[PDB]
Design a binder for this molecule. Structure first.
Ligand SMILES: *[C@@H]1O[C@H](CO)[C@@H](O[C@@H]2O[C@H](CO)[C@@H](O[C@@H]3O[C@H](CO)[C@@H](O)[C@H](O[C@H]4O[C@H](CO)[C@@H](O)[C@H](O)[C@@H]4O)[C@@H]3O)[C@H](O)[C@H]2NC(C)=O)[C@H](O)[C@H]1NC(C)=O
Ligand SMILES: CC1=NCCC[C@@]12CCCCC21OCCO1
Ligand SMILES: CC1=NCCC[C@@]12CCCCC21OCCO1
Ligand SMILES: CC1=NCCC[C@@]12CCCCC21OCCO1
Ligand SMILES: CC1=NCCC[C@@]12CCCCC21OCCO1
Ligand SMILES: CC1=NCCC[C@@]12CCCCC21OCCO1
Ligand SMILES: [Cl-]
Ligand SMILES: [Cl-]
Ligand SMILES: [Cl-]
Ligand SMILES: [Cl-]
Ligand SMILES: [Cl-]
Ligand SMILES: [Cl-]
Lengths: 216, 210, 213, 208, 205
């Protein structure tokens, strides 16, 4: 009825007003500082080991990388915005963390839309799907124990003083692993590590993705 | 009256994209149904070293927004127009088992109709996860790829097919592979992570060496 | 020197009046349809892949059309009869290959020539991979393949296509190509589709070729 | 003084770019000087008759709109600028088989007399039959370079020498250069009444 | 924590260069961290390296007083936001592929540190890679458009950092040096500066 038509128009206006209030009126987050450190939660969903190249020692993975963080500057009261509790927005509208593979051999290829979900508590969920080529010797992939490779993910430019990394579990999600891959997974772990590098005095944080796999 | 026709279309586009506020995407309060259909043009390549298959197809997408409606009488009886896909909201329909970024083979232009219906038909080359084992036998190989929103649940975007049969009428007659069958089926799925329903369209292709 | 300074001001003034002082052209309509003239200059058959049935062509695609909105009187602008402009500054037709297997690769600058009669000429050089079974390329008869070109989104009611000739220009064909051309034609076709009421127009490029011996 | 030199350069660029070129015309034609430095023949593919070259292409032209009095800007005589801040000529290979790959930063040098020097390093795949590369006499291939859209009436081309600069040629390339020439040509095409100008690069090479 | 964010936002606004000149020349410190020789192609004499290239420079225009900005001593910013040097490989065969985010660290003294991870294909004959002596290849890095009078190049050390070299690479590094060189060309009277990266490598045994 007319009332239903009005409710939907009102709901669109409230979303456009919320996005306007958060992005246009307030300056974009300048990133974390020593005085305001940001925790980023990382989890991997391994979809496929596409290729294991024994001529270059590169292995190609397809995965989804779940990134979660919470900003005060993205908080709202749903009661002020027609009970909107979250919205979908372009990744380019918000700050995102510079989470990088430390041993890639080619630029990562993005396989999903660059859209994130922002929730009224200021929490952000971003899940880029990626194809990655990384440094991996697949010697032993044709064996019962298979091959073992590892790749570290973390901020490229922020130390543990500015960006802390967390995992909810040390188990890579294999519930979406392609059942007819050339490679079967023996195990896949994701482990937070804290290091000191020779160059620098700050602690450095990474999540180490370790995959044991063999030819099916 | 050609000057008037151009003026009427420039006025219509100006009215819709400036003087009317734009759509910000669907919500639980204002859910959107997207209709999807595939026209399979070619299975270009089936790689048994990586279990990747390369498809060329076009994907018909259709949806309807109240904000893209107009009265043709008020605009010299214009009933539709073509516009850049960047001038309008488009759904984030994604292959769930791609192994490479989709390559776009057609112009990013949509057709908008006076009822607010949009039709967008991107032609694509897709590499996806597929074991071609059996492709060199009479019963052939079977592979499947799901398509849906990456970021919207069933509470914001619903999907539909207008038919469950993939359009094979443009399938390349001299492909290295013949199609035994091609289906496109709406599926409702729950994931352990999340409470909301998730909707996809499952493209299932059975094929063999010509 | 003063003359050169005057000629530049006139061109900058013409371009500004045409683009800055005019609302952007919305494309053709059923009431204001456009004819696009297409012609192909085939430079090379670079690759014929029998494992995927893909063939790679290098060609120049000439496109011509005319808009009243790009017309000017040369006498009003220092007797300027034409100018070069970025293809982004003007409307261009969405002429697409219908059976490509990869995005077209652009080999030339995206710049067009506009004449005072409102006519535009645009000649993109392209590498195209398209669906082609090269079986018989190593025989006297050779292989035959075909690719249709037309608007992706406009019907025959908005965009008509024409050719000046049904003969593909082979005068630039690479004399030392792996493949020699037995024939190459470009033919306007009118098609009807069960989906849709209006006629659809394409230009069918048919190439007969064999391995150079 | 370092602050002043920076102030003067910023003011010169604002004066040249933000104070007020639509390209050459029949009434205002431009001469472009081209010179090639051949660094490597990377690949010669006898299965497709494509050859891959790495070279840098020196481009020089002169505009009245780019000239200034150095005395008015702290005696600045030249500056570096992004190639996107200025008009650049649409010099194209006429027989490329793939889009050119740019190997260098897109930055030009502008001098107070209005002269511009722009030296893009490129990898080019072009149409070339390497038949005979495995013999004493070697293979011969050629590629024309010129404006894609401007005739001889708007852009003329010049070389400073007909000798391609080989002083930077990779000493351990798979291919040794027997000769490399760059020759201005006046072309007539049966499509078109205008004269067309190109520089023809002819390379004679063989397997080392 | 609201005060810290406000002060950082204020600093970046206040701060936000036309590049170096003969009168305002710049020094760029380069250091290489070699991670992997991925590929050596004897059919084309092209070798593919993965490395991190550390670039450091100092601008007076990027200086601030930390006391005026709530004791902020540095910040991270998009490389797009600031001037960066046009340091280029002189013998690449393909465009460099960037493997890391284009973000730099700016310090209150006006110093900038930018560390792009890159994959480079460059001109290299790998003959002898399967021998005890291995193969030797070299690639020069420098400004494409600035002479030694506008950009000086230097290294902190002539030893390439190998502490991150992939232990299971197809190729082991026998040595890797990074050496400032001064050169002259017939065209040009002013001196040109490059850092010459020399790598001696061989098949892992
Ligand atoms: C936009 O579209 C609308 C809707 O189609 C259109 O309005 C229509 O115009 C036609 C033509 O004038 C109208 O048709 C007339 O209808 C009346 C009855 O209502 C008849 O008596 C008329 O017949 C006489 O005139 C004809 C010549 O026009 C003769 O051939 C005939 O022998 C009779 O003498 C005639 O058929 C129609 O009624 C309207 N419809 C509506 C809903 O208003 C409009 O013109 C279009 N253009 C624009 C820019 O809006
Ligand atoms: C640049 C960088 N990014 C990832 C982790 C740490 C590292 C990588 C190498 C070790 C130290 C480092 O930090 C500052 C300089 O380099
Ligand atoms: C991101 C996503 N998009 C579409 C399918 C479902 C999936 C894919 C991964 C598993 C579940 C998921 O739903 C919400 C969070 O992620
Ligand atoms: C999309 C499309 N592009 C080229 C011509 C027409 C065609 C080609 C395929 C069938 C008909 C079609 O028209 C509307 C739907 O698709
Ligand atoms: C487009 C083009 N540009 C450079 C001269 C050669 C060529 C290429 C084909 C022959 C003639 C031509 O000149 C104008 C029209 O086309
Ligand atoms: C463009 C260029 N940049 C760096 C040194 C090598 C080179 C390439 C050609 C030789 C000299 C040169 O220096 C300035 C002008 O040209
Ligand atoms: Cl943000
Ligand atoms: Cl810690
Ligand atoms: Cl919209
Ligand atoms: Cl136009
Ligand atoms: Cl200019
Ligand atoms: Cl800066």
């Amino acid at each position: 009825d007319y009332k239903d038509d009005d409710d939907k128009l009102h709901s669109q206006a409230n979303l456009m007003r919320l996005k306007s209030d958060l992005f246009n009126r307030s300056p974009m987050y300048p990133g974390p500082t020593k005085d305001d450190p940001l925790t980023v939660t990382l989890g991997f969903t391994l979809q496929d080991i596409v290729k294991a190249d024994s001529s270059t020692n590169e292995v190609d993975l397809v995965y989804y990388e779940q990134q979660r963080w919470k900003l005060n500057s993205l908080m709202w009261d749903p009661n002020e915005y027609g009970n909107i509790t979250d919205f979908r927005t372009s990744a380019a509208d918000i700050w995102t963390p510079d989470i990088t593979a430390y041993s890639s051999t080619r630029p990562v290829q993005v396989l999903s839309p660059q859209i994130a979900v922002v929730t009224h508590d200021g929490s952000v969920m971003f899940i880029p799907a990626q194809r990655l080529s990384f440094m991996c010797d697949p010697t032993g992939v044709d064996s019962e124990e298979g091959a073992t490779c590892a790749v570290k993910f973390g901020s490229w430019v922020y130390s543990g003083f500015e960006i802390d990394l967390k995992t909810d579990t040390d188990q890579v999600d294999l519930s979406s692993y392609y059942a007819s891959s050339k490679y079967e997974i023996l195990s896949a772990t994701q482990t937070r590590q804290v290091q000191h590098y020779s160059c620098c005095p700050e602690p450095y944080i990474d999540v180490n993705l370790v995959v044991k796999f063999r030819e099916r």
